[PDB]
RNA sequence: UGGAGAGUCUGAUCCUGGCUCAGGGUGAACGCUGGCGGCGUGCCUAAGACAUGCAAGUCGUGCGGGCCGCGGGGUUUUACUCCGUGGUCAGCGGCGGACGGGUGAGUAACGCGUGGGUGACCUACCCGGAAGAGGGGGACAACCCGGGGAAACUCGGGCUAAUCCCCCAUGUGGACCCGCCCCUUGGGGUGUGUCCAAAGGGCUUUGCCCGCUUCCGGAUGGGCCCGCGUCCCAUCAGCUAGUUGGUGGGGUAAUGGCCCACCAAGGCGACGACGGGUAGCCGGUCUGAGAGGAUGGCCGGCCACAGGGGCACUGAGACACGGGCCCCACUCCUACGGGAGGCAGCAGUUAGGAAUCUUCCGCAAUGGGCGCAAGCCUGACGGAGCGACGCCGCUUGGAGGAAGAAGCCCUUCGGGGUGUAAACUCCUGAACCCGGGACGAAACCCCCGACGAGGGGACUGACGGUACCGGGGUAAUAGCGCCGGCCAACUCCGUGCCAGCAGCCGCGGUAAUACGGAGGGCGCGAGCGUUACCCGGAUUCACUGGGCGUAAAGGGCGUGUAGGCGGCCUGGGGCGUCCCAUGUGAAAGA
């Protein structure tokens, strides 16, 4: 009895919280950004879409989103922001997106 | 990682190895990529080792890793001899 | 090579989709006579181009949905309902031989 | 282990002289002399016409019992002959004639078949300088079948080679009598053997 | 290069027709018998339940400590404290526990086979190439302190290191929106904008080794998709609601009703839908003249499962045999509150069964995991053990020996048989004794040379003192079946439709070659018979290769649907068909 492969299980729950935390940040910021895009604030939605992107590409640096999984959310975000930003557009910050 | 190693095809007390390219994860006698030579340890025949070096030289370019015993035999057929 | 087939459209009633009937000739493996089997394929028609009775070339494609792994390449021969009427009549015969 | 027991009783059952006894099959004691009828209580009774299988069966035994081999090694030798290229009939004989124990007798090193078997089995026979103690060992053309110098001083060996003086050997064999050497030149042909056995009969025995 | 038949229905005949036998095969079992060795093989039943032991770890060259001990220091002494070192324990962190090993349950299915698609994708470690590593900040174990519980364990407080975690920078480059260019499904390039990098350790410490980061490519491994092939029942004929498609979204490495909302009403079936039964599939194996039939043990490839069911976490990779959570059945501990388990891993036990092995040796070889290395782990593996379970090789003597002993058996009472067989003469020398005594093993490492090529040197056995060689040397296990025909081998006595034989036809009701024993004979021989099962004979499901007037078999007749089939001439096409080239057809087998 008493194999020390339980050491792996103990680490598994460490990484569990880590991955879980970063994801809940990604989601909460993305929904906050797309809220503003739908609500027409062009600067604030952009200032947030940047941090969402930065948080995404940071999550991929580790073992959370490592694959193109990061790219999907980055892709989906910038589209829905730019789309929702088409209601009296005026892309004020213009930082995150391309001309 | 793809490796170069031996595979036992002889019988009980009569071993005959097939120098072989295979993924390290497959069985030592299981499926393999390419047969690159044979080894008779008991040296029962006049020709108990053959390699086809230029083929073995290919797999070392693409990152095959030979065993200590495989590298020992490859050196004996001059895979690494560079003159 | 992507597998390519040539058959006749027997169904218009779906959206963006046509059912293509591809016959096949081959000798029997033991009794040696030439037998004619046939199999229906669900083809993707994005532009709703092809109609009932059209004879089209079908090609193995990246799956569009369940049961839809083929796209319509080109129209070979247009409008021969005799091939369709052959299929309808056989399908119509199954209302008998039940009870 | 092969058949071991009364031999010149099998000279009688086959109806043909079987020289497995070596000598005394030549002297008028073989029991083929003045007793050609088969053994047993009913040996002197008139024999019924043999069935078509009866003839084929007896012909195989007449051949098998001559070399002194169990049916196991016998059958396997046949199935080997049918696959190889050539006439199944003659090839099978040449394979029997390639038996070391049979070559030893054929070379006159031993008086009989059973005797030549024991000479091999005890290591007295040399094949190309090495000892070979297996009677089933198949001799290839060109191999030298000699006598171990350990045994060259044995009185049984100097006995048989004394009567071999001036004696001729088969056209596919040749022997040096003094140095107790010998050589297997070639596979004998059907004509090279005088064996009183119809081979087509034995083949026909195995089609069933 | 290959093809045998026979018995049986009649008083006799021919034909039809079933049954039966000779042959080969087996993971076999049973009876009697049983000498040696080599190579194979060994729970086919309960995927029933399992005692005990072992089967996955490693790294101090990632980091900080606890305990026990030694030595050297700051001090006059003490207290306290600094440094080095040895053992030992876990902890934090990295890589491996997804390989390897087992099983055949479930699956009739893109599960497998085979040939392809991926412009719809992933791939740790390894190899090639380009580039880079600057500064700062933080926490959790160990440990210390307290509490709860019988236990498993668990709760709270405090300190701390790092190759743990985080921020900023540097932007070789990559990611994303949009535009443009070329390709054509999401491929490649380009522009603007935004976002994204990192870690140190080690010494022979000025340089090199083990590592770290981003990107591109290779190699290997894999995911998904497609054509085709894949057992029986029609006494299963109709099936289907995410079911069929669409738009948009969610999710994934990635397509997709994979999931979700909404819209359309579709999708499948006699070319076998749906249901039911059965079953892992193949390479191959057995058989066969072949076509074919049968089978899938061992070995190799794929798949599926890990007591039953469901579920996710961690990760390059799992929905994970020896990881986690939950429900259920069972077994154990229980302070009745609650816990611990999971041999279809190697042996081994029990149950079931006709039946299936040692709780063995070993890290020496090969292979795998970790490490700079030394080395550690490895019931993978290599070996041994047991079992005639299969295959093969080998012995139980060789030669001389009476017109022929004893005994037994038959007899025409003359004699015949066992039979050169034995006795006995001579030679050899299975076992066993004595000595020598392996190959399988050369690298890793060390030294020279630059840790390269190359050269040089050194340690390293389970099997095993076994194999083998040399010497010595004893005549030294034979069994089982059958003898009426097929089918090879016959007489006597015993028994009287009894006792019994029997694969089929049949024997026995007073002379039985068929019962039972003896003598004798035939067949194989360390085996011989038997039962079961598979193919064969069987052309008896007939593609090769059958039939239906009377033998089994024309539908009571018609109409006509589907399907099958198609007169003569020319021409296009080239689907079937034929030919060449090529790729594939793993290895083993044959
Ligand atoms: Mg660990
Ligand atoms: Mg939230
Ligand atoms: Mg993941
Ligand atoms: Mg693999
Ligand atoms: Mg090279
Ligand atoms: Mg040079
Ligand atoms: Mg040079
Ligand atoms: Mg339509
Ligand atoms: Mg769709
Ligand atoms: Mg198209
Ligand atoms: Mg209907
Ligand atoms: Mg043959
Ligand atoms: Mg040929
Ligand atoms: Mg032949
Ligand atoms: Mg000749
Ligand atoms: Mg035959
Ligand atoms: Mg022939
Ligand atoms: Mg021919
Ligand atoms: Mg020819
Ligand atoms: Mg043939
Ligand atoms: Mg009768
Ligand atoms: Mg008759
Ligand atoms: Mg009749
Ligand atoms: Mg009768
Ligand atoms: Mg018949
Ligand atoms: Mg049989
Ligand atoms: Mg064995
Ligand atoms: Mg089982
Ligand atoms: Mg162990
Ligand atoms: Mg230490
Ligand atoms: Mg002191
Ligand atoms: Mg001092
Ligand atoms: Mg003191
Ligand atoms: Mg210290
Ligand atoms: Mg210490
Ligand atoms: Mg440790
Ligand atoms: Mg595990
Ligand atoms: Mg496995
Ligand atoms: Mg096994
Ligand atoms: Mg089913
Ligand atoms: Mg079905
Ligand atoms: Mg397939
Ligand atoms: Mg299929
Ligand atoms: Mg494939
Ligand atoms: Mg701190
Ligand atoms: Mg710090
Ligand atoms: Mg704490
Ligand atoms: Mg704390
Ligand atoms: Mg930055
Ligand atoms: Mg750039
Ligand atoms: Mg730019
Ligand atoms: Mg740092
Ligand atoms: Mg890091
Ligand atoms: Mg590639
Ligand atoms: Mg099917
Ligand atoms: Mg719905
Ligand atoms: Mg969709
Ligand atoms: Mg709509
Ligand atoms: Mg069909
Ligand atoms: Mg099953
Ligand atoms: Mg065959
Ligand atoms: Mg079949
Ligand atoms: Mg099958
Ligand atoms: Mg298997
Ligand atoms: Mg399950
Ligand atoms: Mg179980
Ligand atoms: Mg389960
Ligand atoms: Mg990992
Ligand atoms: Mg699984
Ligand atoms: Mg287990
Ligand atoms: Mg246990
Ligand atoms: Mg029992
Ligand atoms: Mg065993
Ligand atoms: Mg390494
Ligand atoms: Mg261990
Ligand atoms: Mg083994
Ligand atoms: Mg007498
Ligand atoms: Mg004698
Ligand atoms: Mg002696
Ligand atoms: Mg060695
Ligand atoms: Mg050596
Ligand atoms: Mg070592
Ligand atoms: Mg040096
Ligand atoms: Mg060297
Ligand atoms: Mg030793
Ligand atoms: Mg000796
Ligand atoms: Mg004796
Ligand atoms: Mg017979
Ligand atoms: Mg007879
Ligand atoms: Mg009987
Ligand atoms: Mg009487
Ligand atoms: Mg009578
Ligand atoms: Mg009587
Ligand atoms: Mg009798
Ligand atoms: Mg009797
Ligand atoms: Mg008898
Ligand atoms: Mg034998
Ligand atoms: Mg049969
Ligand atoms: Mg047939
Ligand atoms: Mg036939
Ligand atoms: Mg029948
Ligand atoms: Mg026919
Ligand atoms: Mg024909
Ligand atoms: Mg008929
Ligand atoms: Mg009739
Ligand atoms: Mg009529
Ligand atoms: Mg009728
Ligand atoms: Mg015509
Ligand atoms: Mg036609
Ligand atoms: Mg053509
Ligand atoms: Mg092959
Ligand atoms: Mg070969
Ligand atoms: Zn004689």
Curated annotation (Swiss-Prot), chain A:
Chain segments carrying region Disordered: 1-25
Keywords: Ribonucleoprotein, Ribosomal protein, RNA-binding, rRNA-binding
Molecular function terms, GO-annotated: small ribosomal subunit rRNA binding; structural constituent of ribosome
Disulfide bonds: none
SUPFAM superfamilies: Ribosomal protein S20
Keyword Zinc: no
Superkingdom of the source species: Bacteria
GO biological process: translation
GO cellular component: a single term: small ribosomal subunit
Classification via Pfam families: Ribosomal_S20p
Protein purpose: One of the primary rRNA binding proteins, it binds directly to 16S rRNA where it nucleates assembly of the bottom of the body of the 30S subunit, by binding to several RNA helices of the 16S rRNA.
HAMAP family reported in the protein's UniProt record: Ribosomal_bS20 (MF_00500)
Description of how the protein assembles with itself and partners: Part of the 30S ribosomal subunit.
Family stated for the protein in its record: Belongs to the bacterial ribosomal protein bS20 family.
Protein name per the record: Small ribosomal subunit protein bS20
From Swiss-Prot, chain B:
Key words of the record: Ribonucleoprotein, Ribosomal protein
Entries under SUPFAM superfamilies matching the protein: Ribosomal protein S16
Any one GO cellular component localisation term in the record: cytoplasm
Biological process according to GO: translation
An example Gene Ontology molecular-function term: structural constituent of ribosome
Entry-linked InterPro entries: Ribosomal_bS16, Ribosomal_bS16_dom_sf
Statement: the UniProt record of this protein carries the keyword Ribonucleoprotein: yes
Keyword Ribonucleoprotein: yes
Function: Binds to the lower part of the body of the 30S subunit, where it stabilizes two of its domains.
Family per similarity comment: Belongs to the bacterial ribosomal protein bS16 family.
NCBIfam families, per database record: S16
Quaternary structure, from the entry: Part of the 30S ribosomal subunit.
Protein name: Small ribosomal subunit protein bS16
Gene encoding the protein: rpsP
Swiss-Prot record, chain C:
An example Gene Ontology molecular-function term: rRNA binding
Residue intervals passing through the bilayer: none
GO terms (BP aspect): translation
Keywords: Ribonucleoprotein, Ribosomal protein, RNA-binding, rRNA-binding
SUPFAM superfamilies: Nucleic acid-binding proteins
Knockout-associated phenotype: Increased generation time and a temperature-sensitive phenotype.
GO cellular component: cytosolic small ribosomal subunit
PROSITE patterns: RIBOSOMAL_S17 (PS00056)
InterPro entries: NA-bd_OB-fold (IPR012340), Ribosomal_uS17 (IPR000266), Ribosomal_uS17_bact/chlr (IPR019984), Ribosomal_uS17_CS (IPR019979)
Self-association and partners: Part of the 30S ribosomal subunit. Contacts protein S12.
Alphabetized NCBIfam families for the sequence: PRK05610.1, uS17_bact
Family: Belongs to the universal ribosomal protein uS17 family.
Function summary: One of the primary rRNA binding proteins, it binds directly to 16S rRNA where it helps nucleate assembly of the platform and body of the 30S subunit by bringing together and stabilizing interactions between several different RNA helices. The combined cluster of proteins S8, S12 and S17 appears to hold together the shoulder and platform of the 30S subunit.
Protein's UniProt name: Small ribosomal subunit protein uS17
Species of provenance: Thermus thermophilus (strain ATCC 27634 / DSM 579 / HB8)
UniProtKB/Swiss-Prot annotation, chain D:
One annotated GO biological process: ribosomal small subunit biogenesis
Residues the record lists as binding Zn(2+): 8, 11, 25, 30
Pfam families: Ribosomal_S4 (PF00163), S4 (PF01479)
InterPro entries, per database record: Ribosomal_uS4 (IPR022801), Ribosomal_uS4_bac-type (IPR005709), Ribosomal_uS4_CS (IPR018079), Ribosomal_uS4_N (IPR001912), S4_RNA-bd (IPR002942), S4_RNA-bd_sf (IPR036986)
Statement: the UniProt record of this protein carries the keyword rRNA-binding: yes
Superkingdom of the organism of origin: Bacteria
S4 RNA-binding domain: residues covered: 98-160
Database matches in PANTHER family: 30S 40S RIBOSOMAL PROTEIN, SMALL RIBOSOMAL SUBUNIT PROTEIN US4M
Cross-referenced NCBIfam families: PRK05327.1 (NF003717), rpsD_bact (TIGR01017)
Similarity comment text for this entry: Belongs to the universal ribosomal protein uS4 family.
Protein name: Small ribosomal subunit protein uS4
Organismal lineage: Bacteria, Thermotogati, Deinococcota, Deinococci, Thermales
């Amino acid at each position: 009895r008493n194999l020390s492969a339980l050491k792996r299980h103990r680490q598994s729950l460490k990484r569990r919280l880590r991955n879980k935390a970063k994801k809940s940040a990604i989601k909460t910021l993305s929904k906050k950004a797309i809220q503003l895009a739908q609500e027409g604030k062009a600067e604030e939605a952009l200032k947030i879409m940047r941090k969402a992107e930065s948080l995404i590409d940071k999550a991929a640096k580790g073992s959370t989103l490592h694959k193109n999984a990061a790219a999907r959310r980055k892709s989906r975000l910038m589209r829905k922001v730019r789309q929702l930003l088409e209601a009296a557009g005026a892309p004020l910050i213009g930082g995150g997106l391309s001309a | 990682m793809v490796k170069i190693r031996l595979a036992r095809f002889g019988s009980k007390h009569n071993p005959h190895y097939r120098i072989v390219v295979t993924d390290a994860r497959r069985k030592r006698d299981g499926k393999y990529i390419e047969k690159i030579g044979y080894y008779d340890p008991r040296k029962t025949t006049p020709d108990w080792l053959k390699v086809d070096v230029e083929r073995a030289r290919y797999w070392l370019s693409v990152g095959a890793q030979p065993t200590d015993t495989a590298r020992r035999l490859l050196r004996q057929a001059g895979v690494f001899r560079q003159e | 090579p992507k597998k390519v087939l040539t058959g006749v459209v027997v169904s218009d009633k779906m959206q963006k989709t046509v059912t293509v009937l591809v016959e096949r000739q081959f000798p029997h493996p033991l009794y040696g006579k030439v037998i004619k089997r046939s199999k229906k394929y669900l083809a993707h028609d994005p532009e709703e181009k092809y109609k009932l009775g059209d004879v089209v070339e079908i090609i193995e494609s990246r799956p569009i949905s369940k049961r839809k792994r083929f796209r319509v390449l080109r129209l070979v021969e247009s409008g021969r309902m005799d091939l369709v009427e052959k299929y309808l009549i056989r399908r119509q015969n199954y209302e008998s031989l039940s009870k | 282990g092969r058949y071991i027991g009364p031999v010149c009783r099998l000279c009688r059952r086959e109806g043909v002289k079987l020289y497995l006894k070596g000598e005394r099959c030549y002297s008028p004691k073989c029991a083929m002399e003045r007793r050609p009828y088969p053994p047993g209580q009913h040996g002197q009774k008139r024999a019924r016409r043999p069935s078509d299988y009866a003839v084929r069966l007896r012909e195989k035994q007449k051949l098998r019992r001559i070399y002194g081999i169990s049916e196991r090694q016998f059958r396997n030798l046949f199935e080997e002959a049918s696959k190889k290229k050539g006439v199944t009939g003659s090839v099978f004989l040449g394979l029997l004639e390639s038996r070391l124990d049979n070559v030893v007798y054929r070379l006159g090193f031993a008086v009989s078949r059973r005797q030549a078997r024991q000479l091999v089995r005890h290591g007295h026979i040399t094949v190309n300088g090495r000892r070979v103690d297996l009677p089933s060992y198949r001799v290839r053309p060109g191999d030298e079948i000699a006598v171990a110098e350990k045994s060259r001083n044995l009185e049984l060996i100097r006995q048989n080679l004394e009567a071999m003086k001036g004696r001729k050997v088969g056209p596919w064999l040749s022997l040096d009598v003094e140095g107790m050497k010998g050589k297997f030149l070639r596979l004998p042909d059907r004509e090279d053997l005088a064996l009183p056995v119809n081979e087509q009969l034995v083949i026909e025995f195995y089609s069933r």
